[model samples]
Target: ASAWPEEKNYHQPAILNSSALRQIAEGTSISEMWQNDLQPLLIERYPGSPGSYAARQHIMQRIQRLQADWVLEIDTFLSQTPYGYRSFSNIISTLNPTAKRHLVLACHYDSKYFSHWNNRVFVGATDSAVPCAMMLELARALDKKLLSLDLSLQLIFFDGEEAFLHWSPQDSLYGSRHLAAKMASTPHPPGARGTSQLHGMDLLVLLDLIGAPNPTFPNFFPNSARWFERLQAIEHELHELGLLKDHSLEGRYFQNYSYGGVIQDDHIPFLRRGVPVLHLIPSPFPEVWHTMDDNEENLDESTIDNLNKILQVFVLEYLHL
Candidate 1:
């Protein structure tokens, strides 16, 4: 039960670089970001809300901090959602923005409409606070390694992801749909950026519903199953080598993680344009999903650490970190 429907290949080509793995695994500052920056009630973070503005501010500060520390091209653009007429902005951080090809890691920064919705404050910790934090970690970790590579790495924190009232095609994925369309319309050669358009994105990895206890992510794309298996392989390897500290920490790594159908998310817009996607969202979403319970208290530290290390391994192998 992979995360998505796909076929299988018997052979697992080598991606082993023990030295690179060691380097990538060290110096992690990602653990405390979630608790400090985003949590159960940091703010509502919905459109036109005070929390929304504050959320944007927080992200910008972090982006600015990274900018001073690394080489990156950053931008914030306004886009609209489908409810009557509403607008918001998306924050993006890029490594080697001039490169012709890219690998994107994205998550929505907007939580559900809180502060104004019936006195409810949905922080959306797992809905995606943790995922955003994960991207920040990846950026810091991969910064030095990216400059030597030909392909850039794009980190986009999309806004207007949560629907205003109800979930629907028109309401969801506001930023991705617009950006994908904008990118597709530009007449660029493969791996090239046309006009002022960004470079061609080779892969889009969207993460959501993470930072929970014993989470499972299956192969969401048939064509990309090999990468998925490699991710799991890293986890297995780390555990075997006694690096994963929680000896008793366990879950069905690939256990029936199917979404039952195409999961409507930020990836769909890119997927529609024929871009290969690696959706890291849990299939049968966490039990706290969309509920108040989806907060820091419910999150298992071991789960976050384990998944983070696995992804760290994946990043190193993909970019030769």
Candidate 2:
């Protein structure tokens, strides 16, 4: 069932002109992001593993490089799983932490856990590696603009999203569950009456299972359909501006259809707390999903870069930058 309430208020986000979008797009390079940020993240990052710690450190370092006014916080906790109790850390970076409202861009940084040695090499490139990289690149490209806006932009790289043994409520979403509860109990920054950190979020855009060839995202929540439509329009605008490569990949990534199912991910905790969510996972699981084939070899650069531009433009418009 859809949680919270159906969003009745509809407002059109400010659309950026072709030249403006081109400026942001030109300043960013997909190859640099793919190489410098994404490649390092292409490893097994399940909870408490060496790869998982390395992935978290890499994300922290990249955010430090931004040199913007980002306030970083690492939320570490231990959870009980079938295997045993495992430690998890969720990385949080906010542009303006004091702001009353926030627009969160999030993705799970951990890879799925595997038992056998053969499957231990699983790198989860599309599962979330690409999505994490996209958020980092966007932060770099839009640092100045994001800082100038009154509305804050928060980035969360969630840990322990995958189930150790099997997918179950307790087995999955360890990081999200812990952080959501903490935010609910924690009060908002001074001047907000009777509200908590979880209440300050304007929207949570969770990206997952991306960076594959010919990926299509359905509108999962009616509350965020207008925002989803904005992403669709951005794709179309980028193509018309000649800013996107691969015509086949453009104009179709963000589908306009209303979807009925919600593939559970890190957003469930926030959605249940009455936060508006825009889930950007492709409808059908990628062919390489959960298999060792989900490595960098199966990823499509054209698709990755194309989505980079679309999302960059979307953030710019959403923030009116």
Candidate 3:
């Protein structure tokens, strides 16, 4: 039998409140929360600038709070000499001691330093903050139920995803590459080997550019065919459960795009390392992507709610809860 029920009931408010939707629409304070929070979180905290230092401090506080129940590991690395770009990887292990399967859900936490014509420091709200917040919410929701699962979950907040000079081969995906390398070297957790022959990991889900009005998922990594089926199944399940509206127009539904092809993101390193990966990112790209306009004003609680629900069900299915 399928883990998810086919006849699920997706619930939505009876009368669609246009005003509520409008409150979250662009140019509202509700939408600006992401930008406001991210500016200090990424630009003021670490190594980039005063803003970067503040951003790092905020992230550190969040990590500390999240570490109470999860195994939090901060992996740090320095860019090759001459460039000296300092980077770090934040891994929050939400695994049950007895889990035999492993999966990673990830998103980068860095902001773009360049905005081309605008010349404003990019806050990367939708580019990443939304997904990062989604992961944190997912972690909290799944923490209590994780021990019953056969799977091990890792929530990674990556650093240095933006290109130092330009978004190219040299500077991009640095954190994911480092994490995948580390995973390969690390031994499977105790009781996590299903069998000596059946290696551990089941899949990976990388979330990016997910906060926007009328958001859409544009398939995933090439190696994720089976994983894509699982995501589609979840989308179907959520629709039936009345938790998601069938907003799909044209040939833009999840399945239609699944056959379209793969995208380049944080999932690539894991794919190359033999892990099947599902890259849950928006397509057609958001208008404010990597721009000064990529701020909290572009986000809404509904968007966050939808992502949380999809991920919640996905995790429950993974854990058989």
Candidate 4:
């Protein structure tokens, strides 16, 4: 705190529109954006398709351009699944890569199969498309403030979160599983001084189904309840300050308690290794969870508005800004 950037320099106020947020999902905008732009360009972004790789490169380019000093790398690794050897990568761009403790914000960029149809060109917008875009917005928001601290603020976009055939434990979470395993094996980080090892990932906030209307996020793990409560507190403060807009009528945006039983998600891979997690998914979940209707049309504009506002405050709060 002594030698860090002065408080006068960090007068960011609040998270509003990053260029990423401005262009991504904002209302019915992304509905047209996906069908006309992303769906056409990133058709079926599975590892098996050429479009998937194109999509990957697209995100990498945007991140690199956003921050000049951050360490950006694609953590590519091979996955020897029962189907065959599948290649997957976790895109981790970070500030303070050498720091022992890190706060990681992650989302899956891949879309899954829809049994109702051919599912070849299925665009998983709320499935993860919106969350991925939200992560990009967060990265843009946190750039300057993150660089000023030693505690790492990492933005990770995971590939292959969807299962090859179904959502079984063995098939799902391919990217996160591989990345966590490799971290257990390797000692060197991408842009570190060659002595850094990824340790103490204190908080892993996994965002999913974030673009839907009125989601309630419950703490999956009892240990991470404090952070979830903090998020709940922020939502209240933002609402009272008139920052949450219409969400002020709803009283609370995120749920902050358990939804049902434990839901299996990307965090399972990290949780097995003892990393604490806050699963930012709606309590009842979205109506079109795995269907063809889970596209941009179903995305709730006000939901997008409220969640993004909450996250901006949460990051500043977590970093002690």
On TM-score, the leading prediction is 2
Worst 10 residues of 3 by lDDT: 4-13
Give lDDT for model 2.
0.84
Clashing pairs in 1: 3-218, 3-219, 4-219, 4-220, 6-222
lDDT of 1 by residue, 1-321 (tens): 221111112223347565545555564545555555555235567766777778777766665665323343333355545546666667777666555566678888888763435765678778888887777666655555554555446778877778876788777777677777776776443343333233256667788889777667878777666667677778777767655646343564554344547787888877877777788988679999888777777887767766677776776666554
Clash numbers, per candidate: 5, 0, 35, 1
List ranges where model 1 is wrong by over 4 Å.
1-16, 35-41, 67-83, 114-120, 147-149, 187-199, 247-260
- Candidate 2's clash total is 0
> For every model shown, what is its TM-score relative to the native structure?
0.83, 0.93, 0.73, 0.80
- Please report how far candidate 4 places residue 115 from its true position, in Å: 8.4
Q: Look at candidate 2 and tell me the lDDT of residue 280.
A: 90
- The C-alpha local distance difference test score for the whole of candidate 4 amounts to 0.66
Model 2 misses residue 252 by how many Å?
0.8
Instruction: Give Cα-based local distance difference scores for all models.
Output: 0.66, 0.84, 0.57, 0.66
lDDT of 1 at 225: 66
lDDT (tens digit, per residue) of candidate 2 on 91-198: 999888887667789999999987656535878999899999999999988877766654668999999888887788789999998898998888776555567788
Candidate 3 lDDT, 1-321, residue by residue in tens: 222111111211122133422222221232333444444443412224565445555655554564334655667776651267564544444455344455668788776556346555566777787777666655544545554444556667777666666667666777777777776665454533323101345667888887777666756555555556665665565555455533442423355554366566777777776676677877767888766777767765665565566666665555454
